[PDB]
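cache lookup: miss for this entity combination. No prior model stored, computing from scratch. Input as submitted by user K.M.:
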Amino acid sequence: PPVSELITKAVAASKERSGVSLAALKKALAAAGYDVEKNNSRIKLGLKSLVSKGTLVQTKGTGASGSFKLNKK
DNA sequence: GCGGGGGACAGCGCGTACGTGCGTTTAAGCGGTGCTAGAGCTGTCTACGACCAATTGAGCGGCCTCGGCACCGGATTCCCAAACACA
């Protein structure tokens, strides 16, 4: 399954008012058996694609270093 | 021993400052010349310090006193830690 679903599912499972950090996303995907080490660069890209698709709102920071929430709009 | 909160450490981004490279300029390095100030050595003779015996008073041990400082309690003050009002 593509990493955009795994990320969206992790952000939905950890839904809050702040927003899953990249470190929490790493932890959730690793707990989901996804190798976050080798494919970290893929994650940053896929995450960026999800922000560029507007599917994730950046709530703090800039780019992948930030916190993110599912764009309910 | 325990609760917790701040700091250490991890991850990311970015932007500019440092490394690499190239061409030009500059002055370091080398050699060579010349001059003279001063370092190094020597002889003299003289004032200056070591040595010694005698004198003595300055300093050291021993006693004694009191005041400066330590201590205690009581009052004064001064930073504190969130909670509140209000943005």
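stored under new cache key. Strands of chain A lie at 20-21, 56-60, 67-70.
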